[model samples]
Target: KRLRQVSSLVLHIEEAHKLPVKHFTNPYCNIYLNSVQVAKTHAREGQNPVWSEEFVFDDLPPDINRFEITLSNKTKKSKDPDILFMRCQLSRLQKGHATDEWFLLSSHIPLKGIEPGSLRVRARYSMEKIMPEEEYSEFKELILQKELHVVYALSHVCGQDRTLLASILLRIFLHEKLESLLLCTLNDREISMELFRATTLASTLMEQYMKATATQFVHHALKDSILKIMESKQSCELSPSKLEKNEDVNTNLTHLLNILSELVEKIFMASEILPPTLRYIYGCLQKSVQHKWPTNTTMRTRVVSGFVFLRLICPAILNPRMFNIISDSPSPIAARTLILVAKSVQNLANLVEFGAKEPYMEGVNPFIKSNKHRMIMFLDELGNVPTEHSRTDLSRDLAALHEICVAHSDELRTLSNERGAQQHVLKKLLAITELLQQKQNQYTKTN
Candidate 1:
C-alpha cells in the first residue's frame, strides 16, 4: 500500500463578531487538527476583532479532514477566559481545493443568551506520497542499536526540557512502529539484544534519578510547592479583590501539579517498560525505604511522595490503557502484580511513620516474599508461549533476575527487621500480598 503524502494546510482567519467585553478582552483565533494545536492567530483588540492572519501547518497527514477553530478571549489578569465567542468544526474539507466559507461560532450553550458570531476563513491542503525506501529505513539501524538510541534520545531531551522529554518518551513508548518491533521480540519469548540493552539503559537511568541527590531534589521541589499551596490556603481571604488573585493561585497549583504529574508519570512508565534485573529493582526498593525515607525528612514530604507513587504512578501502570500509551490491553496478571507491588510500596511508606518495629517487620516480610515470587513467575511465563525456538537465553536471564530478586528481598527484610506500623494498615498489606502469592501460584501451575 502506498503511503499518503503529507500536505501543508494554509488557513486564513478573516474575522469574527459579537465578541463581548467587560473591562478588557483580548481575542485570538486558534486552529487545531486531530486535537493538536496547529496554528494560532495573534490576539486582536476587543472592538471589531479582525486578524486577517495566515497560519500554515505543514506535513499533516492527508487523512486529517476535520479542522477545529476556536475563538477565545484572553485577559491580562487571568490565564484565559471561559467565554468563547465561537467554537466550530470543519469536516471533510476537501484536500487540494481552496475553500472560502463562513463558520458559525456559537456559545457552549445556545440558550445562555449569548450572541453568536460568524468566522470567515480560507483553507487549502495538498496530499503527496513519500519515497518507499526512505520510509522503510527511517530508523532501521538506529532501532537495531536498541537501548543506545532510546537512552540517548531520552537523556538528551531530559536535559534540554523536561516537559518535552515527557511527551517524547510517551510517544516512543506508544508509537505503533516501535511497538510492533518490540512485540516481535516479546512474542517470540526471546529477548532482543536491542530490548535487553534498552532495559539495562532504563534501569541505569532510573537508578541515577532515584539516588540521594536526585531524590532530595525531587523531595524539595514537591515539598516547597505543596507548602506554598498550604500556606496560601490557610491565609487566603474571599474578598472581592482577593478573588482574582485566588484565580492566579489556582492556576499556579494547576501548573505545579502538571509538572509533578509529568515527571512522576515518566518515571513510572520507564519502570514499566523495562523488566529490570532483580538487583536493580531491589536496589531501587531499598533506596526508597532505607535512605530516601530518613527520620530527618518531614512527614509532609514523605506523605506527598507516597501519594505521587500510589495515586499517580500506580494507577498509570495498572490502567495503562487509560493513558493511551499501550494500544494493547494490559495483561490482567501483569496489571494485578504491578498494582500489588505499588500498594506494598505504599505500605512501606506508611510503615515508616508509625515509629514501631514489630508490625513493620511483619508487614515487610510478606511483601518481600510475595513480590519476589510474583516477578519470577511473570518472567517464567513469558518463556511458556507456544514457540518452537528454544528460549534458553531468555530463561538464563530470568534466572539471573530471580536470583537478584531473592538476594535483595532478603536484604530488604533485614533492613525492615527493626521497624513497625499501624495494625490495620499491616492487615491490608498482608491481604494484598496474600492475593499476590495466590496469583503467582496459579500462574505457575497453569504454565
Candidate 2:
C-alpha cells in the first residue's frame, strides 16, 4: 500500500461572529481553508464574511469537504483522536443555498457518520492555549532555567554564596554579638531592636544565603506557587533589583529575596507543600499587578502572564490527567484560584492570549500606540506563528515574539496608509525588525 499525502487535511479557521473565540465552543460565521483566518470571516459581531473569507483550496480533492467522521456503537469505548470532528452544511440552516457549506469544531466523538451511539457528547474545546502535559512540564523547566541563569550570573559576580554566608555568620557571632553586649553594658537598648526582633531575625540574617542560591524550586510545587513566584518576585528577586551600588548590604538583601523565592517555590513543589505560602504569593502578585503593568516591570508581568496562561490552558487542551486539570484534581484547585485571581485583576490587558490579542501588547511593543489596535494587529500575525511545536519556554517565547511582531505590525499597517504616520511607524518597525533579526541570526549561528 502506498502512503498517500494528506492533501485533504486543510486546517480551517472557524470565525466567531457573536462571540470572540476564547475556546472552540461557539459556532463560526465563516471558515477559511488556507492557513490564515481573515477578518472577513473572523471579525467580531456586526461583521460579515467576504469573498476573501472563502478560500479555494487546491489541497483537497474528491469533495473532501466532508469531515472524517467515525462512529462507535458504544460511547464508553470509542477509539477517537484527542480532537473531535464535526461537519454541517450551511444550506440546512439557511433558506436558500447551493452546494452545502461545510464547518468543523471540537467534538468528543465523530457523530457525522454514525447512525447510533449512546447519544452522549464528551468533547473538550480546542480553541484556548491548552498545552500538552509534557510540553507544560518542559515549559516549567525553561522558566526555571531562565530565572536560574540570572541568579547564577549575579551570584558569581557578587561572590554571594556560601562564602558570604561564612562572613555573615562570623560577623554575627563576633561583631554583632559583641556590639550588642557592649550596647547592653552601656545601657543603650534601642540598637537591640535590629538584633532583638526575635520573631525571626536570625532567619532574616540568612537573606544573604538565599540571594546566593538559584531559582529552580517551583516545578513540582503547587501551580499557584509557581504563578506567585513568576508574578510577584521572580524577576526582581532573582535579578537583585534591590541591590545598591555598594554591593555590600544591598547585594546581600537583594539576593536573599531571590533565594527565599526559590526556596519557597521549592518547598511548595516538594512533598510537603505550603498552601498558605501559595495563597500569600498569589495575593501579593495580584495586588502588585496594577503597579507592575504601567511601570518598567511590565515586561516581567507580560512574560509571567504568558507563562501562566500556557500552563493552565495547555494541560487542559493536551493531556488533562497529567496535571489534574479537572475540577476534582488537586492541581486544578490552586491553578483555578490563580486563574480567577488573574481574571479579577482590573487591568488584565497585560496578560497573554492565544491567536493574538495579548493584554500587554502596548507595554512590550513600542510600535503599538493604541491598546485595542495592538490587539487587532496581533490577530493579523497569528497566522505566521507555527503551533505544532511542543510546549517549552523557547516555544512560548517564539509564540510571544511572533505575537508581538503581529501586534506591532498593526501600527505599521495603519501608518502605511498615511504619509505622516508612515515615517514613524516604518522607522519603529525597522528598528524592531532589525533587532529581532539580529537575535534570530545569533540564535541560528549558535544552534
Candidate 3:
C-alpha cells in the first residue's frame, strides 16, 4: 500500500547574536509555513534577544514549500527592515530528530563594523507516515511484542520524548476494536493518581491526547474569553510569592475567582465548542477508570480532570499565545496573572487544597476549596458524554502510530541500521517516510 507523509515542525527560537541594534532593540519573531502566517513569539528586550519559545506547525501539506522566519525589533528604524529573514532546506530537516545549529541570516545587509548575526534555533521535524489500519495492526505487534525489550529505550530517555511516545500510544488506542482493550490495560495498573501518571502507560497516553486536542478543541472552547484574559491584564495574584507588598490577599483572591467562575460558566455554556471526538475519548476513559477502580468514588473525576485541566485547560490559561488564543503574546502583567490563575485552577481541579509544598499558595486554598465543586461539576458533566458509538476522522488519530514508527526507525538507524529484533518494522517505517521525502526532493533537486 502507498504511504502518505504527515509532517510537524517545532521551531525553538533560541537567540540571534551580533545584530546591528546591539543595545537598541526588542526582538520578536514571525513564522510562516505553507505560505500562511503561523505565529509571533513575544518581544523580548536585549541586544541579542533570546526567546525560548517553541512554535509548532503540524500537518504539512504535500509538495511542501518554503518556511520563513521573520525577525525584527520595534525601534521603527529607517525602513523597519527585518534583522533576519530565514528560509528552510528540506535536506537539513530530518525525521523526528531534534537538531540545533546556528543559521546565517540572509538578506545580508551587512554593516561593516557589525556582522549580521547568526540564529540559533532548535528544530525538530517529526514526519509521520499514514498507511492502512492493518499496517498499524502489524506495527502494534512489534511494539507490544513491549507491553511485555522496549522498556530501556522508552524509559531512560529525555522528558521531551513522552509527548511523542504518548502520541504513538494514544492513537493506537483510538480505534474501535482496540479502544476497550486499551482502556482495560490501564485498569490493570496502579490507582494512586500520581503513580498512575508516573510510569504507567495509562495516564501518559491520555494526557498527551488531551494536550494535542486542546489547541483545536478544548481551549478554543473559550477562545474569545481567553483573548480577553490576555488583553485585559487582569490581576488575580492569589499566591504569596507573587503579591506586591501590602496588597490585600483576599482582594486579589476574589478577583481571580470571579475570572475563574465566569470562565467555568462560559465553558459550560459553550460546551458545544469542544470537539465531540475528544468528549467521547474522555467519556470512554471515565468509564474504564470507573470499571477499573470501583471502590474509589472520585477516581474517574480525577482521571478526567487531570488531562482536561492539568494538561490542557489550565495550561492554555497560562500561555494563551502558544495555543494561538492571542495573535501576539500577552502583556507581562496579564501573563503573570494567568500563571497565578493557573495555579489556583489546577489545585481546585485536582480536588485538593494547597498543602505545605509552597505556603504562598496555601492562603488561597480556602478559595480553591470553596471553588472546588464547580470544577468537579464541570469535569463530571464532561466525562458523562456518551461513548456508545465510535469516532470519525480516523486519519488524524492514526498519525500517532506513524510517529511511533518514525521514532523507531531513527532508533534503528542510530543503533547501526535496521538489522535488529525490529528490522522489518524499521524497514517499513523508513520506506514510507523516505519515499515521501524522496518524491518531494525531485522538485527541489534541480533548483
Please give the range of 10 consecutive residues that has the lowest summed lDDT in model 1. Answer: 187-196
Q: lDDT of each prediction vs. the true structure?
A: 0.42, 0.31, 0.64
Question: For model 1, how does the per-residue alpha-carbon lDDT over 1-447 read when each residue is reduced to its tens digit?
Answer: 232335677788987766655422677876788666777788888746888888877777756656777676766676764444333343555756778877766554343564565788888865433323232232323333343322233333233334333333323433323432333222122122212223333333232323311333333323333323323332222123534553554343343334334433334333333222222333333233334345633332332333334444445445555544445663443343334334444443344311244332233344335344333333233222222211222222222222222334433333334345323332332343344335435544554
List ranges where model 1 is wrong by over 4 Å.
1-4, 21-24, 85-91, 109-111, 129-447
Score every model by TM-score: 0.27, 0.21, 0.55
List ranges where model 2 is wrong by over 4 Å. 1-70, 75-264, 267-328, 331-417, 421-447
Top lDDT model = 3
Clashing pairs in 2: 130-313, 130-314, 131-314, 210-259, 211-255, 211-256, 220-269, 221-269, 349-359
Candidate 2 structure lDDT = 0.31
Question: What would the per-residue lDDT of candidate 3 be over residues 1-447, giving only the tens digit for each residue?
Answer: 455567778889998877566523787777888557878888887767888898888787666665778776766556545666688865578777899988777653555566666778888888765554554453445445333123223432324566555554555455444544444344343342323556545566655555555565555455766667766754667666767788887777677767767776676666666666667766766776777678887887887777777777787787776777776877777777677667877888888987888776676677677767777777777755675443544544544544444446565445335256645554554566455345435533543
Q: Give me the overall lDDT of model 1.
A: 0.42
After superposition on all CA atoms, what RMSD does each candidate show versus the true structure?
22.5, 25.1, 8.1
RMSD in Å for model 1: 22.5
Better of 1 and 3 by lDDT: 3
- Candidate 3's TM-score reads 0.55
Highest-TM-score candidate: 3
Predicted structure 1: clash tally = 6
